[PDB]
Structures are given as C-alpha cells and as structure tokens.
C-alpha cells in the first residue's frame, strides 16, 4: 500500500524549543512565492538566513519546515504563497510558547492537510496521537521510551486506546515473571522484534524500523513533556498531576476534523491557537485559575522564607506579576499572568530543593549519581537509563546543577538545559551557551561541564568554554552588572591540554576559569553534606571565597603544568580544613 502505520515526531529539530527562532526566520519571508519553480528564490533566501542562526553554526529546507508545517504554523496558500498562521505569529513572537504547543499538539491529528490521501486513508487513520497517548497513560500509569517507540507510534486510531493498554499490561506481566535482568532484556527485544514484524535484507529491514521508533519517542517525549502535560517520573512519561482537569478535558473535547483536504480551512481552525477554547477560559476562570496559582508560589515561598532567604527573589518577581492586573483584568493579560506565575513556580521549586537537601540520603543520591560518572561508559548508561529518560550527557548538567543548589545562597540557579515541570532533565543546553549560570549576590558561576575525555575534550571543551566565558563577561559590562564573573569546569577526568589551554587564557586573556575534577566537585558536595550534619552550611561568602581562592592560584602559580595542578590541590585542601569537617 502507499498507506503508513506509525505517526511521527521529526528529529528536526528533536526538541521543541528549537522551533522558534526558525519560525521567527521563516515569518520574514510570509507572503513569497514558494511552490514551484517560481518559490525557489524565497526557499533559498530562507535556506542562508537560516543558517546564519547560532544553532547551526557549531539540510533540505524542506525538512527543516516540514514540521512547522505539521504542527500549523505555516501552510503555502493555494495560489503557492507562504502564509504564517495566528499560531505561528505567536510562536515567532515568542507569547506564551508552552501554551502554543500545547494547543497545536492537542488539535494535531491524521489524517490533516500533511497527511492525507493514499498514505492515510480514513479506514486506517483517525488519531489525535498527543491525546493518545494521555488516554493510554490513563490506564497504565507510565511509559518509558521504549514503550513509546514499541506501543504507542503504530497506533493510528484514537479508538485503539483499550486495545493496547491491556496489550501493555499483559507484556509487563509476561515480563515480570522472567526470572533475572538479562532475561527479561531478550524477552523484551523478542516481543518488540516479532510485534514489528508483524505491522511491516530482512532482519536489517525490521530492525532499522525498531531504532526510528526508538528514536521518534525520545523526540515525542521531548515535545510533550514541552506542554507541560506530561512529566518525567524516572524513566517513564506520566502525566502532570497539576494539570488532571486540565487533561480530562482535552481527552473529553478532542476530535480528528473531516475538512483536512483543503489548506485554507484547515487552517482556518488549525492556525488558530484560541482553539481549542478551554471552559476555564474566560474572564471569571481565569481569574481563579491566577489566583489558585498565587496562593500556590504564597506557599512555597512562605515555608521556605525563613531558612532560605534567596527565595526573596521570586517573592518580588510574582508581586511585580499580578500589579499588572492593577490597570487591566482581561483575558490576554491574564492568560499572560498565568503563564509568567507558572514560570515563576518553577523558580520557586528550583529553591525548594535547598530545603529538600537538608535530607541527607537526597543529598547523598546526587552523590551517588555523580559517582556514577567514574566507571566506564556502558555501566553509565545503563544506571542513567534505569532512572532517566535524558541520555546520560545531560544528566550529568542535571546532576551538577543539582550540586549547586546543594552549595546553596545563589540567587538564581539557571540551568540552561532544558528540564520540565517536576525539574527533570529533558535536552542539553545548545552550544552557544554554558550549561548553567549560577548568580550570586556580588559574583557569577558558569558551571561547564563534560563526560568528554582526552583530545576530544579539548576539541570539544577549549574553545566553547573561553567563548561563553568572554560573551558572558561583555554582556555583564554591556549590562553595567558588577559582579566578577568565573567559569567552573568539571568533567571526570581534565585533559591536561584543556587544563593548560584554560590557565593561559586567565593569565593571558583575563579569563577566570577553574577546572576541578568530579572527585573535587564531589568532595565540596561532601563538605557541605557534613555541615548540614552539624546544624551548618556553607555561606556565599564561603563560596565566593572558594571561587576567588583558586582563581588566584591559576594566575599566581609557576607556570608548570603539574605546578598549578598541586596549587590547585592545595587550595582546596586549605578551604576544605577550614571548614573543620571530618573525612
């Protein structure tokens, strides 16, 4: 047949956020000719502008707008024009983004404009696949990714819901009763290897299948976990229990439109990112919906106000919020308000775990966790595969971020991976940016980090880590911001050429970069751990004192390689004895 059997989430890009500042390019060129021969001189304009974007300097334009096409952003008119949806305009304009995916992906369906005809005929296909999935997990509580990729892609009907949650529930309890982890993997490869089989050089054919359905669901995991609607819970997506009225009434409401064949009334409903419209959104629930979320930030930032006064930050940030509904109460500036309170909660969860890490055994997790990073390279990722749904590199961010807010007293822990509503990781930071920056009262932390080894860390690690260290440093005085600014480089084990490289740019360049081994970023975890025991902690003065102590190391000592790496020992040991703790 023409006819496909299993929906699709591109990997261009594999995670959400990336689609923005494509659109915002791509919005330039709304009302070209872009079919045909006579669309070439637009698509290829397009094609450098794009280009020239941070995110590709460190593809068939086609592919790169197929999916802003899939999800109604775009559509070309029928006289051949490129036309930009109210869906896309708000994408580009970057209003509310979580909120636009979420209702995209909810209205996503097949058939649809893109996918329609021979391919996907309507006896096969009516399935909205976001809405799919929140049904299935209704009845089965999680999916990994696996169960995504085995399950959930090659359903192409909403009906068939019932169906394969108990197909799910039965292959875990076949599963369950293998005896021992090595035969429970081949079992699980079998019934995926055989069920694939079925719905499609032979076993090379079937297998290719497998690992794009593998790689789909890690991108569909990464788009819903985007809306907010579903979270990560170790390996599994769950739904958000924040949001179950929420998700009880896309399931109830959603529905696959039967005026797909043509582009401007499909687009007419699909391009509009009113729809669907949600009960709770008018004036009078929308105004509970702010003020339920209010108390919600109240009473976070209430608990922790006293042992955590950084939490001040967000106390002010969430009055300088809802003062706007001092001069309007509408629905746009409340829907606005909601979004920034709900941004603003996250903030305040970021803060929360200082006072979940008052707990050691949640301390000592991430500890452990970091450890982890000292064996080799198949044990790490089958530990990280177990616990997460991210790939182990951006774990690692994930896990030392964590260790800065075990650290404590900054003002804003902004990680630049991306992480979900329950704080999980999802992708890694993109490569114009470090990993994370911490921000403290009088002083900033770029936390860099790596699983990287040998020449390839230099290659990879040398100059990313120089250049967000000097952007950062003159956006700063761009900003007048008058903090002295360091760059803390972890990885498992320093190549020595990316330790050098970095100790001449300080002395050379006025860098202040400090390489510390993991063992060295756990052994600070570990003092601090002590300290808690101790009714102490650290203070930001304390670590403030860390920062400068060995910065002034990399530029004081002899020039020799093993020279500055004993001062740097040295330096620690000194602020580590200060702190009276026992090893």
């Not at 970057?94 to 995916?101: I, L, M, Y």
């Not at 299948?209 to 997506?237: E, H, S």
């Not at 009473?299 to 300088?320: G, S």
């Not at 114009?432 to 860390?457: C, H, R, W």
């Amino acid at each position: 047949m023409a006819k496909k059997v299993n929906w699709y989430v591109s990997c261009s890009p594999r995670s959400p956020e990336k689609i923005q500042p494509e659109l915002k390019v791509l919005a330039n060129f709304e009302g070209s000719y872009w079919k045909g021969v006579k669309g070439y001189k637009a698509q290829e304009a397009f094609a450098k502008e794009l280009a020239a974007l941070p995110q590709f300097l460190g593809f068939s334009t086609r592919d790169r707008v197929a999916p802003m096409k899939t999800y109604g952003f775009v559509f070309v008119d029928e006289e051949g024009y490129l036309r930009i949806t109210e869906a896309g305009k708000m994408l580009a304009n970057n209003r509310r983004p979580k909120d636009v995916f979420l209702k995209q992906l909810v209205k996503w369906q097949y058939p649809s404009f893109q996918h329609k005809g021979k391919e996907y005929p309507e006896e096969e296909w009516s399935i909205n696949p976001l809405v799919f999935v929140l049904s299935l997990l209704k009845k089965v509580g999680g999916l990994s990714k696996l169960d995504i990729a085995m399950f959930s892609l090659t359903a192409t009907n909403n009906n068939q819901v019932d169906e394969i949650a108990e197909e799910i529930m039965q292959f875990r309890n076949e599963r369950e009763k293998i005896k021992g982890q090595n035969k429970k993997l081949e079992f699980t490869e079998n019934y995926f290897f055989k069920r694939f089989e079925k719905i499609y050089s032979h076993k090379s054919k079937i297998e290719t299948k497998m690992r794009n359905a593998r790689d789909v669901a890690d991108a569909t995991t990464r788009y819903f976990r985007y809306t907010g609607l579903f979270v990560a819970r170790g390996n599994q997506l769950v739904l958000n229990p924040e949001k179950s009225d929420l998700i009880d009434e896309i399931i109830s409401s959603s529905k696959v439109v039967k005026n797909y064949t043509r582009v401007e009334e499909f687009h007419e409903y699909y391009g509009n990112p009113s729809l669907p419209q949600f009960s709770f959104e008018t004036k009078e629930q929308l105004l509970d919906l702010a003020h339920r979320i209010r108390d919600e930030n109240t009473r976070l930032a209430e608990q922790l106000v006293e042992h955590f006064p950084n939490v001040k930050v967000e106390i002010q940030v969430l009055e300088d919020i809802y003062n706007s509904l001092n001069k309007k109460v509408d629905v746009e500036t409340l829907k606005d308000v909601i979004y920034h309170a709900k941004e603003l909660q996250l903030e305040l969860k970021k803060k929360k775990l200082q006072a979940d890490f008052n707990d050691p055994r949640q301390l000592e997790e991430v500890i452990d966790l970091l450890e982890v990073y000292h064996e080799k390279k198949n044990v790490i990722e089958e530990k990280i595969k177990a616990r997460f749904i991210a790939n182990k590199n951006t774990v690692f961010e994930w896990l030392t971020w964590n260790g800065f807010i075990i650290l404590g007293n900054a003002l804003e822990y902004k990680n630049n991976f991306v992480i979900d509503e329950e704080l999980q990781p999802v992708t890694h930071a993109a490569g114009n940016q470090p990993d994370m920056e911490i921000i403290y009262e009088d002083f900033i932390v770029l936390g860099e980090v790596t699983t990287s080894k040998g020449a390839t860390q230099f290659k990879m690690e040398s100059e990313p880590v120089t250049r967000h260290y000097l952007n950062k440093k003159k956006e700063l005085e761009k900003q007048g911001v008058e903090k002295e600014l360091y760059s803390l480089f972890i990885a498992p084990e320093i190549n020595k050429n990316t330790f050098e490289e970095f100790m001449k740019y300080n002395i050379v360049q006025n860098t202040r970069i400090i390489p510390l081994s993991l063992k060295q970023f756990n052994m600070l975890l570990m003092v601090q751990k002590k300290l808690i025991e101790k009714g102490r902690r650290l203070s930001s003065y304390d670590i403030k004192n860390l920062m400068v102590s060995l910065y002034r190391t990399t530029i004081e000592s002899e020039r020799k390689y093993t020279q500055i790496k004993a001062g740097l020992e040295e330096t620690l040991n000194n602020w580590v004895v200060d702190k009276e703790v026992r090893f």
